[model samples]
Target: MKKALICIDYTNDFAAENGALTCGEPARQIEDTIVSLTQAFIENGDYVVFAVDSHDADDDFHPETRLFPPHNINGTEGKELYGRLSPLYEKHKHAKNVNYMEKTRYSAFAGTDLELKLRERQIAELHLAGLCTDICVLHTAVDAYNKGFQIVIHQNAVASFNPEGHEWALSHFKNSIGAQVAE
Candidate 1:
């Protein structure tokens, strides 16, 4: 069965307090876990995709932008990936199984080609990680669940600025969303 490693919006816009939205850990403590996960996925001839923020500055409040500052404005520093993962994404971008999906909402699949891409790969299972557990991570998990993908969340690779919110998201993922948790 084909498996996919999905990295959500781990962008600079949500890494620190000064950023647009502060995530628990900008790069998520177990950064190596995601790096290695990506490596393993590709080396094993599977798929690895990064669902990154590509917010438009000219559009409407974007549903969530009104609650936060203008961030991840298209091609900008804040929209870019944090730390080494940027280069990692860059390096593997050319790989047949590696790709990036641009998104404007909490759920990456809202209007993107993520579902189609995964379908084309015939990926039956997904390993997910990224920023803001209560937001993007949670929503994406629910979306994946709805799509019938067996999901495992990389617990350490995704976090939220609020520990309580993070915890809530984790519980919700396992309970409300029916997703599995992994370290």
Candidate 2:
């Protein structure tokens, strides 16, 4: 019955590597913020869930692939969790059982059993933080809201490849779904 905090792809492949498809300032800026947020969630006895972007090796050249080629394919070191957030796995071994879901689309719920897990835990409130604020965060937040979970976005803990889109999405969530921007 604990509240849940879901963290979406804060991986090194997307956030840390030089010349990576989605790598840049947003990743660097939010690095410490994510770590701190994870720590705070653990201290509060809330369940922490991490959604990783997992793909198959053939995912790279798939004709259907449209968004920025393919990254974080399975078995690739680049798909590993970012180092900064890795310690959460080790430190809170018991509570840090990260629920990793391989998502191909922007929405985490598109390919994952996230909704089922959330319901299983009876989690009614969700605090979300992670990358690409405009796409994944926005999509997942909307879906979570529609599914009846009160959603809160930790604005400072998330950044976007598209700043304008990110801002617009945040506004949409706040205005349309009553998603709060956590202070």
Candidate 3:
């Protein structure tokens, strides 16, 4: 099975300090590890997928901005990858073995062609990393599970705004979704 690193929503608004909805420095702190993992997978000739959260001003999912304030607006800097990792994203995103999926929902697969892209690349196993371990990361893991992809979550590379969700997600993914938790 081809294993891939599916990085979900490591954008400016989610992981950086002073970001719109940062998971705080817990998320920012993981940047180095995440980047290192991305590089390792890239050098190993494995697929690397960056699933970004890009939203429209009047996004249908949060039409009234009720769920979240106006953040990650499609054309804004907030929609870009966290500054430190942006260069890597830019450099590899269009390369032959990299894939990019822009999503508006908690689940990276929602409203995106992520599944098709993975399948097309014959990726059978996915190792996930990125912000909000309880929400975005959790949702994406389950969706990948539903689609029958072997899942592994890099515990050291994901963070949430709180300890409760982060802890729960790590366990839930392994116990309920058959996901392997790793560094």
Candidate 4:
């Protein structure tokens, strides 16, 4: 079975301590696990997708503008992939298996060509990682569920600012979406 690792919103604005809409220590702690999984995926010749959040400085039409503070703005270092993933992504970005995508919304599949990419590669199963377990990761899993894709979420590689929400999301992924929660 062909599998792809979808790393969503592992950016400075989400994971960095000083980030605008940071998830703080919970998000920061996943860096090594995410990076290791990326490397393993690359070495195994599986697809590795970096689905990062992108925002404009001034955009009233965007709902997130009203919901949260400024974050992941275009042309800013805050939008760059957090920690070692940035350098690792740079090293293999040009490879056919590596996809660096800018997402304007919460879910990686929303307003993105992620579906087409996976379709083109005949990739059926998706392994997820990255920031905000209860937000981006949760949304992505739901979308993936609706799209009929097999989902596996890395427990250690995903987190949220809210401890209760994080635990709730983990359960949601497992029960609601029927996604496998990997330890």
RMSD of 1: 1.8
Tens digit of per-residue lDDT, candidate 2, span 1-183:
358888888887778755245647777688888899987887887778887776664654643356555677677667766767877755666554455567766678876788888888788889899887887788888789778888889998888878898789788879998988985
Better of 1 and 3 by lDDT: 3
In the range 29-105, model 4's lDDT, one tens digit per residue, is: 98999899999999889999999888885889988888888899889999989999999999999998998898998
Name the 10 consecutive residues with the lowest summed lDDT in model 2: 57-66
List RMSD in Å for every model shown.
1.8, 2.4, 1.5, 0.9
Model 2 steric clash pairs:
none
Off by over 4 Å in 3: 60-64
Q: Output the better candidate (1/2) by TM-score.
A: 1
lDDT of 3 by residue, 1-183 (tens): 888888888888887777888788798889889888887887788988888887776755564467677777788888888866789877776777787777878888988988888888898899999888999899998889889999999999999999999999999999999898996
Per-model TM-score on C-alpha atoms: 0.91, 0.88, 0.93, 0.97
- Model 3, C-alpha of 167: deviation from truth (Å): 0.3
Clashing residue pair totals per candidate (backbone < 3 A):
2, 0, 0, 0
Sort by lDDT, top down from the best: 4, 3, 1, 2
Q: Relative to the true structure, how large is the alpha-carbon lDDT of every model?
A: 0.80, 0.77, 0.85, 0.92
